[PDB]
Amino acid sequence: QGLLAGKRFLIAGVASKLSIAYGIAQALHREGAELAFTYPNEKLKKRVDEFAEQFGSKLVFPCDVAVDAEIDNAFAELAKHWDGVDGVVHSIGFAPAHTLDGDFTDVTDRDGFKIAHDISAYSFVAMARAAKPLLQARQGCLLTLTYQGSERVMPNYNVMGMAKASLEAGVRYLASSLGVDGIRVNAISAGPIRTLAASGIKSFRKMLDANEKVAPLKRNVTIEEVGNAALFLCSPWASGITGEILYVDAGFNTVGMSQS
Amino acid sequence: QGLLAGKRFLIAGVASKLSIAYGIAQALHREGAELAFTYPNEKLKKRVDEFAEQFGSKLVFPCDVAVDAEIDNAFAELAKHWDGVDGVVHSIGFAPAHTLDGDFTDVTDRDGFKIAHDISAYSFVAMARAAKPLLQARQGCLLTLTYQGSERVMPNYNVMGMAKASLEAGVRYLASSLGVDGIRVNAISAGPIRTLAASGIKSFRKMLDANEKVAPLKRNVTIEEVGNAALFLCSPWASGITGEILYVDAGFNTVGMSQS
Amino acid sequence: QGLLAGKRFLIAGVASKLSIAYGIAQALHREGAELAFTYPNEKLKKRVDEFAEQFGSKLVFPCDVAVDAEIDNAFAELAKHWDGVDGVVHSIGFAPAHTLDGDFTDVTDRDGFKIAHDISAYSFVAMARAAKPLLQARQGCLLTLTYQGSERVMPNYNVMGMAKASLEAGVRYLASSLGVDGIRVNAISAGPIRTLAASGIKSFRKMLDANEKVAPLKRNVTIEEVGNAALFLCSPWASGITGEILYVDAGFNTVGMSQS
Amino acid sequence: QGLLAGKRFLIAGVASKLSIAYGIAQALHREGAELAFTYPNEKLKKRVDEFAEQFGSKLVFPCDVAVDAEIDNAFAELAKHWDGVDGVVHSIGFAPAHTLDGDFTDVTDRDGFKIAHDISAYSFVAMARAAKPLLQARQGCLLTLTYQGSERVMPNYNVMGMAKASLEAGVRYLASSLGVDGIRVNAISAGPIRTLAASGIKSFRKMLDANEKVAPLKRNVTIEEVGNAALFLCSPWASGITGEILYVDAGFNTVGMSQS
Ligand SMILES: NC(=O)c1ccc[n+]([C@@H]2O[C@H](COP(=O)([O-])OP(=O)(O)OC[C@H]3O[C@@H](n4cnc5c(N)ncnc54)[C@H](O)[C@@H]3O)[C@@H](O)[C@H]2O)c1
Ligand SMILES: NC(=O)c1ccc[n+]([C@@H]2O[C@H](COP(=O)([O-])OP(=O)(O)OC[C@H]3O[C@@H](n4cnc5c(N)ncnc54)[C@H](O)[C@@H]3O)[C@@H](O)[C@H]2O)c1
Ligand SMILES: NC(=O)c1ccc[n+]([C@@H]2O[C@H](COP(=O)([O-])OP(=O)(O)OC[C@H]3O[C@@H](n4cnc5c(N)ncnc54)[C@H](O)[C@@H]3O)[C@@H](O)[C@H]2O)c1
Ligand SMILES: NC(=O)c1ccc[n+]([C@@H]2O[C@H](COP(=O)([O-])OP(=O)(O)OC[C@H]3O[C@@H](n4cnc5c(N)ncnc54)[C@H](O)[C@@H]3O)[C@@H](O)[C@H]2O)c1
């Protein structure tokens, strides 16, 4: 038996096999978890069904976190199939491209700010409410991904750095609120990894090349290592850890100035 | 001839004689600065006109930071009068009443999140964009107010924690964007202060009494030490300080666990 | 197999069955690890022989970290039995009772300060150096314990706060130095736990009680939960992690102010 | 008059006209402070009398911070002239050369650890204790200098980072220990400036080049910009500010990764 024998986990935000969430899906399944999966939109449905089956899963649901009623239904639809759940993994984030390309002051407009924070920060609080019942059942847990662009400035990150800072404070507030029920809320801050949201971004190459040089382990981290770190926080080995941001970035955050 | 002699400062967020905005206006004036002012809406037009008079000022303009026209217009209006400005002081913050009262997961709703972040965080960026031409002239600087509820959970603060965390990251993103022009960007993390944004609230009472016991100096902060600290971060004595979050809370944030 | 099958770990700082290093050992053996052990003075030896016998181990050595030869010695003595080690686990700390018993200014003399930083902080840098040859073979990994009394004031803790601050800086620096050799350095900020360090102290309970009231999971943490976190940080599941301070304190570090 | 109208201030650690101590003293004298100085060893005495002459001071005393006797005497010898005192500025920092030149794990020996901590971290505590009676009288304040080597890795800083972290904790433990006598205790974390610590070192030249590139204000900071921030923390404008590490580094600390 694996560490999560006969446990249930919903995984929000699986678009491709390069995803962080795919790396998280692998790891949990490896340790004998039973996965459910949400999809954002009808175009993604067939691919998420293929990914679901790859993890021996037939529990797929449409959930666009921009809509309230999709969040409510997607967990009311899950409540039919499962009478409880051990963890929900939030691995969602978005910003309009125009707010990510350039200098923060000019391109950061109201509507792009409003979306960044809605999808990337409020979805997690929305999802935490719509899960609270099925989580209370098994004293389950929450996991989200964040980026250190929130604590310190990173080129081009811009309005995401704010929406990610909102989300990390939001982790600590969910943790205190849901603590009394036995639910743990945690996040991982991942180093840069090549996925869909990095597709063809030219900054990303140089920026990964910089992260590789600056980091203490002299390499960029893998979706495998983010998967294993997530698993730990989704497991009973992390029962004393709530409210935590776990940096999985080779120790890049700890470096103030690199020799060359 | 005080420290700020023949300098100009727009002060955004004066609603009463209790306000941190008021305290800041007092000490900047007390050092010989030419203040301009803004007011949210028509109902607060007279009271601010009255508070404007007090500091030799007649440069009062309408600014609801919810609307994009009103932000840009009021920064043209001022550009007729002034051809330069040494500082802008953001001191605006709002969240709907039901978001600041209950269980975080239970009470915190999509629009309440949108609104809180929109007024309490994006307004700062929007004002920095609008204020950018004038500040370029004098190589001036920005200042906003934040609360350590972002960094560590406080009771009944909830989504404002998420909104302040977003604002504080914003301060750093601005610090880097506008730093090429000598424009500084800082914030003050004020202890709790009975100002207008706590009246009718019986929790805030208990909150000030706790703060007095935990704080090292064993006393709350009113608005004149927050005012004098804003004076400092707005003076040429802080020419080397940008992107800072200065804690004006008589040490509260350093205490891990206070005796009883 | 267990996760740590065919892996070797040294455990420095086993005093009693209340100890954290004791708890750590139980976790590591439970997943198939072959432990070594150390003892500081002659009076401890047989108790450490007996704890080592409980984990199927006759690798028990003298290592008083006050003495350089005794640190240099044991890692030559270990070098006979093992060609390569998968990690040292530093779990040593000390301060003269009189320094942890009163007002910080009144009681913090030069020798107290000297011992505190020598045993609790410096030692980790020495035992990193002594252990580096055996660590490079299997790309092993270090791990010390710390208390959040470094980052915020806890009453009585006093000089150990400055020692732990030094130690946590010790971690980030070693992590950069030894990263090049593939080595991971990490710490755990454990919540307060009743162990032989507190045995005689009245005020520690009132401190343990406070933690339970403030912490979001409303409970203290066990040497098991610390132990299980230390297993994860010593494994291939934490290969993407170095320089981290992982809080295992049921989320006490996230709360600025708790209901009552 | 200026801000510090007939206040008294002690300045430990003026080495030359390039020192921060000197630069602070200057800015403190500008606002009407009567200054007293100390010197370390018999060589520096004339130079420190020569400098103390520049600012109106014949109050100059011998104080090697390695020795307890000269601390208790220096504050007994000051107590003759001055009945009370308004602040003590601690600009003392020292580590061996060998410890600040190489790989961290190799060059850090027990004695170099003990010197770096004992001088750069304990000296600040020891002086606060001797200076209590005089400080208590005028409800005076303490200031110290630190480097963000404590919080993140800057190359070749090595064991000093452990001492600056140790120090930065002591600022908090002293802020809460001496807080009940209305004594404020703060530190300035200063950007890199060329001083007598930098003289002879060649890495320093390169480290300022990068710090200028990275820092949002595109410039290093001046002893006058550190002077005027110290002034603020030693003044009545900072009465709500204790236990603070104020960054005066052109916002370098706020940058995760600079473009280029
Ligand atoms: N890429 C990195 O190196 C990195 C580093 C740190 C943190 N992260 C975080 O990891 C998370 C996962 O991103 P990723 O790296 O796997 O990239 P990704 O683009 O594959 O993942 C983001 C996911 O968000 C989903 N999503 C977008 N809008 C949605 C909506 N309205 N409703 C529902 N789902 C929606 C997408 O379908 C997608 O699967 C993000 O929140 C990101 O900020 C990534
Ligand atoms: N009082 C505290 O405990 C404390 C501590 C730290 C920081 N802060 C923050 O400092 C700032 C100042 O608050 P305050 O203490 O002066 O209270 P306040 O109510 O006097 O000030 C808030 C200001 O925001 C303005 N405002 C609200 N909604 C607006 C809108 N739609 N458009 C434009 N202006 C709008 C109000 O007119 C008012 O002037 C806020 O951001 C607050 O959150 C408060
Ligand atoms: N228990 C807590 O509240 C707590 C919380 C966080 C961190 N910590 C830290 O974790 C570590 C483990 O503490 P513990 O709870 O296991 O206490 P413990 O007393 O059970 O273990 C401390 C160990 O340090 C050893 N030690 C003391 N002086 C030594 C010396 N000169 N040379 C070598 N070894 C020496 C002791 O003999 C013992 O084995 C310490 O560094 C402590 O500061 C403790
Ligand atoms: N300049 C920078 O780059 C920089 C940046 C951040 C922090 N700092 C810190 O600021 C402080 C001032 O450094 P500086 O730039 O003026 O260099 P400096 O060497 O000129 O000043 C340090 C002072 O410490 C004194 N000192 C050393 N050992 C002593 C002892 N045993 N007893 C008494 N006095 C002793 C010296 O006499 C000297 O005046 C130090 O703590 C330094 O670590 C410097």
Which class for C194: exposed (0-12), middle (13-18), buried (19 or more C-beta within 10 A)? middle
Pairwise CA distance, residues B196 & B15, whole Å:
7
Please report, for residues A103, A153, B181, D212, the alpha-carbon distance to residue D259 in angstroms, rounded to integers and kept in the order given.
11, 10, 16, 13
Rounded-to-integer distance, Cα B76 and Cα B173, Å? 24
As to burial, measured by CB atoms within 10 angstroms (0-12 exposed, 13-18 middle, 19+ buried), residue B116 is buried
Cα separation of B62 and C112, whole Å?
Answer: 62
Q: In this structure, is the dihedral angle defined by the CA atoms of residues D20, D22, D26 and D28, taken in order, positive or negative?
A: positive
Question: If you search the block for the tokens 């707010």, which residue do you land on?
Answer: A99
First vs last C-alpha separation in chain D: 47
Tokens of D226: 């550190």
Distance, CA of A251 to CA of A218 (rounded, Å): 9
Q: Which amino acid is at C88?
A: V
D29: tokens are 């004298």
Tokens of B125: 């960026």
**B148, B254, B257: residue with CB nearest C210:** B257
Q: In a 3-state reduction of DSSP, which class is residue B114? A: helix
Give the one of C222, C225, C237 whose C-beta lies nearest to A229's C-beta.
C237
Could you tell me if B176 and A153 are in contact, meaning their C-beta atoms sit under 8 angstroms apart?
A: yes
The reply to whether C213 touches chain B by the CB within 8 Å rule is no
Contacts of C151 in chain B (CB under 8 A): 256
Task: Give chain A as a 3 state SS string.
Answer: CCCCCCEEEEEECCCCCCCHHHHHHHHHHHCCEEEEEEECCHHHHHHHHHHHHHCCCCCEEECCCCCHHHHHHHHHHHHHHCCCCCEEEECCCCCCHHHHCCCHHHHCCHHHHHHHHHHHHHHHHHHHHHHHHHHHHHCCEEEEEECHHHCCECCCCCHHHHHHHHHHHHHHHHHHHCCCCCCEEEEEEECCCCCCCCCCCHHHHHHHHHHHHHCCCCCCCCHHHHHHHHHHHCCHHHCCCCCCEEEECCCHHHECCCCC
CA atoms within 13 A on the CB side of B12: 30
Amino acid at B206: K
Residues lining ligand 4, judged by CB closer than 6 Å? D 13-15, 19-21, 40, 63-66, 91-94, 119-120, 145-147, 190, 192-193, 195-197
The rounded radius of gyration (Å) of the Cα atoms in chain A is 18
Ligand 2 centroid to Cα of residue A10, in Å, is 40
SS3 content of chain D, % helix, strand, coil (to 5): 45, 15, 40
CB atoms within 10 A of CB D252: 25
Task: Look up B22 and say whether it is catalytic.
Answer: no
> DSSP states of C144-161 as a string?
EEE-GGGTSB-TTTTHHH
At position C32, the amino acid (one-letter code) is G
Indicate the burial class of B171 (C-beta count within 10 angstroms; 0-12, 13-18, 19 or more): buried
| Experiment type | X-ray
Q: What backbone phi and psi angles, to 5 degrees, belong to B41?
A: -145, 175
- Do C146 and C25 touch, CB atoms closer than 8 A? no
The closest alpha carbon to A51, from A12, A95, A99, belongs to A12
Q: Which atom of ligand 3 is nearest to the CA of C148?
A: 6
Counting ligands in written order, which one lies closest to the CA of residue D148?
4
The 8-class DSSP code of residue B157 comes to T
Nearest Cα neighbor of D201 from D120, D104, D108, D100 is D100
Cβ of A118 less than 6 Å from ligand 1: no
- The amino acid at residue A169 is A
Breaks in chain D, named by the residue before each, with C–N above 2.5 Å? none
Tokens of B199: 């009246």
- Inter-axis angle of helices D159-177 and D123-130, nearest 10: 20
Write out residues 175-194 of D within 8 Å (CB-CB) of B.
175-176, 179-180, 182, 184, 191
Rounded to 5°, angle at Cα B99 from B93 and B101: 115
> What is the per-residue burial (b if ≥16 Cβ within 10 Å, else e) of A138-165?
bebbbbbbbbbbbbbbbbbbbbbbbbbb
B175 contacts A161? CB cut-off 8 A? no
Containing C113, the helix (H) or strand (E) segment is: helix C110-117
Burial class (CB in 10 A: 0-12, 13-18, 19+), B126: buried
Q: State how far the Cα of B111 lies from the Cα of D204, in Å rounded to an integer.
A: 52
CA torsion, ordered C40, C43, C44, C47, to nearest 10 deg = 160
Residue C152, chain B, CB below 8 Å: the answer is: yes
Half-sphere exposure of A241 (CA within 13 A, CB side): 31
Cited resolution, angstroms: 2.8
What's the CA gap between A68 and C202, in Å, rounded?
52
CA dihedral in degrees (D151, D154, D158, D161; nearest 10)? -30
Q: Hey, is B59 helix, strand or coil?
A: coil
CA–CA separation, D152 and C243 (whole Å): 10
- How many angstroms is it from A92 CA to the middle of ligand 1? 4
For strands A141-146 and A87-90, give the pairing: parallel
Distance from CA of A210 to the nearest CA of B (A): 19
Of residues D154, D216, D259, nearest to A257 (C-beta): D154
C30 close to C223: Cβ distance less than 8 angstroms? no
Cα C226 from Cα A234, distance rounded (Å) = 16
* Of B92, B185, D248, nearest in space to A104 by CA: B185
Q: Return the ligand 1 atom nearest residue A66 CA.
A: 31
Q: Give the distance (Å) from ligand 3 centre to CA of residue C93.
A: 4
C219 phi and psi, to 5 degrees?
-145, 160
- Cα–Cα separations (whole angstroms), residue B141 to B109, B180, B185, D59: 35, 12, 6, 40
What is the distance between the terminal CA atoms of chain B, rounded to a whole angstrom? Answer: 48
Distance of alpha carbon C139 from alpha carbon C184, whole angstroms: 8
Domains of chain D are 1-260 (3.40.50.720)
Nearest to A214, CA basis, from D217, B176, D192, D258: D258
Q: How far apart are CA B245 and CA D57, in angstroms?
A: 36
Name subunits touching C (3+ CB pairs < 8 A). Answer: A, B, D
Closest CA to D70 of D58, D80, D61, D59: D61
D169–chain C Cβ distance below 8 A for any pair: yes
- Chain C closest CA to D158's CA: distance in Å? 7
Q: Which of residues 62-101 of B touch C (CB under 8 A)?
A: none
- Residue A226 in tokens: 């983010």
* Residues of A classed as catalytic: 147, 157
Whether the Cβ atoms of residue D126 and residue D67 lie closer than 8 Å to each other: no
Q: E strands, chain D, where?
A: 8-12, 34-39, 60-62, 87-90, 141-146, 184-190, 245-248
Helix (DSSP H) and strand (DSSP E) numbers for chain C: 9, 7
Cα Dmax for chain A: 57
Per DSSP, helices labelled H in chain B are 20-29, 45-54, 68-81, 104-107, 110-117, 123-130, 132-138, 159-177, 203-214, 224-234
Distance CA C78, CA C133 (A): 11
Contacts of residue A229 in chain C, CB cutoff 8 Å? 237-238, 240-241
C235-C239-C244-C246 Cα dihedral, nearest 10 degrees: -40
Contact between residue C141 and residue C87 where contact means Cβ atoms under 8 Å apart: yes
- DSSP code for D234: T
